[PDB]
Amino acid sequence: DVTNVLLKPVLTEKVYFNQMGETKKYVFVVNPKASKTRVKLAFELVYGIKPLKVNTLIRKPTTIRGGSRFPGLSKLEKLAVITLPKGIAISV
Amino acid sequence: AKKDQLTLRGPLYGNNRSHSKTITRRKWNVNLQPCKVKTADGKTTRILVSTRTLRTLKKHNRL
Amino acid sequence: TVAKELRQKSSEELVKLVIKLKGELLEYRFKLAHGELDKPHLINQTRRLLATILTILTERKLNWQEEQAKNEAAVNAWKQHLEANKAKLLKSRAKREDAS
Amino acid sequence: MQRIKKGDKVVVITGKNKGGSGIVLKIMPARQQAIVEGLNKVTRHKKKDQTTKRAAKQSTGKVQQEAPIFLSKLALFDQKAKQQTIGKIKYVMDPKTNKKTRVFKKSNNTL
RNA sequence: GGGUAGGUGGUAAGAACCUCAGAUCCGGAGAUUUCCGAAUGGAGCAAUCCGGUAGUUGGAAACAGCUAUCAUUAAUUGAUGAAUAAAUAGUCAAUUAAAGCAAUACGUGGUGAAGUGAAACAUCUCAGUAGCCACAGGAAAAGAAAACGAAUGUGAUUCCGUGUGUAGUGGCGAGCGAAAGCGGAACAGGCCAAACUUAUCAUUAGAUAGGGGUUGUAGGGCUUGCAAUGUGGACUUGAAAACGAUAGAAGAAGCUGUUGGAAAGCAGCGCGCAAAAGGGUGAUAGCCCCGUAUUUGAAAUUGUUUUCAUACCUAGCGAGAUCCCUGAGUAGCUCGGAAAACGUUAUUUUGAGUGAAUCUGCCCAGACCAUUGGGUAAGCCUAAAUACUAAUUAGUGACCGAUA
RNA sequence: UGAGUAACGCUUGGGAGUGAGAAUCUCCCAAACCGAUUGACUAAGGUUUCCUGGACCAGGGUCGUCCUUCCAGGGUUAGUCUGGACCUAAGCUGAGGCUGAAAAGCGUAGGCGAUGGACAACAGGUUAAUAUUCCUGUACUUACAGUUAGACUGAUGGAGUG
RNA sequence: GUUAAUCUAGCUGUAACCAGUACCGAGAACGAACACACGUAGUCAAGGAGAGGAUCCUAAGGUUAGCGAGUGAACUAUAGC
Secondary structure, eight states, rough: OOOOOOBBOOOOOOHHHHHHHSOEEEEEEEEEOOHHHHHHHHHHHHOOOOOOEEEEEEEEEEEESSSSSOOOOOOOEEEEEEOSSSSOOOOO | OOSSSSOOOOOEEEEOOOOOOOOOOEEOOOOOOEEEEETTTTTEEEEEEEEEHHHHHHHHHOO | OOOHHHOOOOOTTHHHHHHHHHHHHHHHEEEHSSTTTOOHHHHHHHHHHHHHHHHHHHSOOOSSTTTTTOOOOOHHHHHHHHHHHHHHHHHHHHHHHHHO | OOOOOOSSSEEEOOSTTTTOOOEEEEETTTEEEEEEEOOOOOOEEEETTOSSOOSSOOOOEEEOOOOOGGGGGGEOOOOSSSSSOOOOOOOOOOOOOSOOOEEEESOOBBO
């Protein structure tokens, strides 16, 4: 109960396609050390709705800015997708 | 190890020669023998003991 | 300044203020993920205020004094989901018992 | 203490702009410049339009803008007397009204 | 605490803010310090997974958050406890220390090369060097004579110069190289066992804890006297003081013309220095700026030294007496080595055996005996004087200037 | 200098379009190809090269509007699949222990180490980038309570299948 | 334990964690300093003739081998005669 596992909700075209259906999908970026149950509890105690399905995925660090005289690396990121029972939508 | 349990004193390393006076790095091992020692607690225990320390114990009534 | 934090009741009011500031900062960061924030400077100010309150609490004891007594449309959607699941299970069992 | 306080009048000792007066606005003591209004009006060329044709208020032409002046070239101005001499500065005076005060070496006039 | 007007670390232009109700900045003192990592709750492919135990909140629960703990060894203490009755090993519980890293540099110790030189090479040198390993420490090691050694002698040890390329040692070959003494650096000696005695140990204790002494001009213990009340530091704490160290302050003196893009250079007349070190400023500036010599300044932390008080340790001169004690596998001896300048010789040290005396003693003075003289081993401890600089501060350089 | 020479490392044509410029870019139609393979599906390894938009300085053995090149923005979704929390073969580590100048070497109790064992989900559709995972339909397992019916349950250990 | 525990069966509610999941993958992205004719685990495996996954042409599906255009000397390689 610290709510230190919700960094930023992303807004991409895939997301925009996702909420237009009947499920109102939500996606957050999460501290890489937080599990499914931690995210579920945080989401329950941040809006008041108990999620049905909670799924997670990862992005490996990737080389970015190939030509810069210094090759940087993309940061490790973990995303959590949360879905709600059909027929409800909540603002962020 | 090849050392008596009464005092840390192991082998000695030196040079071995012949009539040709050639050098050879050779070790000399202190003699050990498992003779039981009776500690003044009603107990006996076998430990590796040098023969010289064994003579000292024999003359000191320590078995 | 920070001297005004020593004066107040450092038992229960400060921790409630910490929780409220944490919630507001989380909402601020969520707005930062969006376009409608318009006040860049508030993030660092709130972060430093939280750091100061955490220091002044830590000088005495812990932050989490949980030993005390620390939406609404979800019920409708949950009722609909339970009804749908119940109907699916009932029809499945009815067909299963009608098979023989 | 610093020789120049933001707000007071200043003059220039050496350079092309002899006998010039001005008011100080910005000071960068880390790398030792000084910004005075009305002096060193360099002709900036607002090179913005040719980057791309999207922005507005991007092609105005030759515009006069201020240029930094090295701090050591300046001298504070004296006007507490009919015949004033642009002199040195002394920090030692310590009235109880404030921490320290400043005074011209060649005369006795506050600030 | 210092110190004030800008500040939001560099690639930095900027949108949005803080700011003289004393910001940024400097110094001191404080907290969070995720994970790995000696990693130590258990594992592992380092930055991963899985837990047990005790509280606390949600609940009906699985479980989930929020907190704390859970390695080993060694030592100490207690309970438990086998074969075997007791007892021992083992087991459990509790407390206390390490466990590693590095300063490419010093020290001690263990182990320990070859190339090469000898124009080959085995003796030998390299070399007790390199490597590996153990442990440090702020330096380390050594240390108070069983010494030297030829003297009407010096008097712990350590380092430097000399003695000296000497005496000598070497298939007498390459080579190797002291010890006295002298002149310097610094300088100070203390503490245990022993007889004697007290108290306690199934008083058989042989063990535990107290006084007593620290030894060669032989000393100490014993019986018995006189006179101290103090010299003092390898030294416990309290009170103060000085001088530093970690932030800062005050802190002098110029114009005019000139070539000139710009003057500070150049020319004329001036000014100050306990400050003419240095750096910057549109050309080489003492007087444009920061500064610099000097005088000052410490809320807090910290170092050295000084004074007083205080705890422990310490002191001189007699008399008796064949009274007692004075460092045991000890030293020599033999068999092989090794440090010694010596390639094994007294000296020293030891792997195997052998194995005394008690002041009428023992050892030493390069085989040994006798005489003479010197010193008291086989117990322990020690400051400075010596080597080194990865770190911090300031400064220096007939050291370098982008193939350096 | 060798020198604008040797080589440029398994193949074409036409039309339209793009374009500043096209044998090479795009589209269209043909042909010539391997087809137990140059195809469809994945192990180990590469870590973004996958998709979209832009560009052609450098890289493309010619050119280039185009590229596995660069820049900018996105993309992998699991109670059931791959491997953990289940199990063991070599083998590794290893309390106590033995052994060796030291470093260390051996080894017991244990613990790790699958290429194997047990273990419950299938068909279809959707996106440029994912789909036994997202979605529609239909299923199963293992804990967990409350409740209900019946039943004395039967291990760390023994024995057979395994 | 039998004042009940322990499982078994159905109903009601509840839980199911962590890491991989793109693309390439007998090759232009992997190992050969390369957009090299080299090398590499397993799985699918069409029709005619054929014992056959050989041989020939094809199906599904997929490539245009990252220099070319000419002439058709000697000579070289490949083949045919």
